[model samples]
Target chain A: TACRKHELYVSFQDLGWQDWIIAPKGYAANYCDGECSFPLNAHMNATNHAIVQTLVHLMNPEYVPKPCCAPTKLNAISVLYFDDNSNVILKKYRNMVVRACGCH
Target chain B: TACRKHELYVSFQDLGWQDWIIAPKGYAANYCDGECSFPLNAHMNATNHAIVQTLVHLMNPEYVPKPCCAPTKLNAISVLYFDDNSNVILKKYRNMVVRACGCH
Candidate 1:
């Protein structure tokens, strides 16, 4: 087993787009302009399409959130936007926190 | 503000592609085969939807140019088909240049 911690990080970065940084455990950061970060939970499901759409919403406020993110049983996830110079502009989509075994 | 490092290095590389080198800013480059780079404006407003569609077109053409380079917007953004080896088998989209950015 690759362990959930290792698997989670790999899945996040591999979703595409670089310049993402992992902060402590419960936190992570993305520093790419208009870039969005999608976090995965215990169920191990995330897709590029969903991430892109989330970004679209960030660009236009009128765009409504579609039911994305996976496994529904997840603890939480987040999305943020940045400017051309890679500065964080907005932080959207943080789910209700949950507790799990061996989690802090 | 991260001094646009001095704004726009070909406005290319950072679009994605690791092996990219600054062929001198206005002539920056990309290397990761399927990667797509979108040239920006002196205005600095880029949309992810446009970039994705551009990439989708590069992956499958027939999506013609809406337009490149400026102040339209000053200066731009290659490809290869390889069998896991970074060999150039196909070089699809190279633009018809209208130089003002002192490019080669």
Candidate 2:
């Protein structure tokens, strides 16, 4: 049984990177409920995108990206860093993906 | 004896013209007085500059000036007009010059 997922994507241009957040497949218990049941954490994901963009802009004025996936979640990954050349220079950083409910 | 006069020049880029206002030789009556004692009107001159700039920018998008004297006052002359070609098309218009104290 497949149900339609509600999706919202917000994108912003910061100093050197483009950020995007996607909320896929979820319903709220209440209109203002702060929970998502789709194995996706939309609120935290969006906030992370915002903070990353601001920090990157402040640190590197000349940073730019070729085109890359923005705030995607295989897990609840948090922070990722790129080099001046925009390569994934920091590959082993945690919060790149976090398992939901501590499950694989 | 020649007294040293203080001059303030403000310039702006409007739609098609460079506008300016100059205040020469003045002193205040009280610390916060709205009065000037140099046979010159500072407050009105600045306000008139602002209004003219707004109207000119609204009406003419391509107005520019080579260089010209800004809000100078032989009198409290208010409004003056220039043509599209920046020529003195309207000379006999009132406010071209106002005789303060009706002296000269």
The 10-residue segment of model 1 chain B with minimum total lDDT is: B66-75
> What's candidate 1's i-RMS value?
19.1
Residue runs of model 2 more than 4 Å from their true location after superposition: A1-6, A12-16, A19-81, A90-104, B1-104
* DockQ, Cα level, model 2: 0.01
Candidate 1's residue-wise lDDT over A43-81, tens digit each?
A: 433232233333434554363232121112223345454
lDDT of 2 at A15: 17
Model 1: per-residue Cα lDDT over B1-104, one tens digit each = 11111121123233333343323222322110112245532124322322332333454454222111111122222343344555545433332121222100
- Residue A36's lDDT in candidate 2: 17
The TM-score measured for candidate 2 stands at 0.13
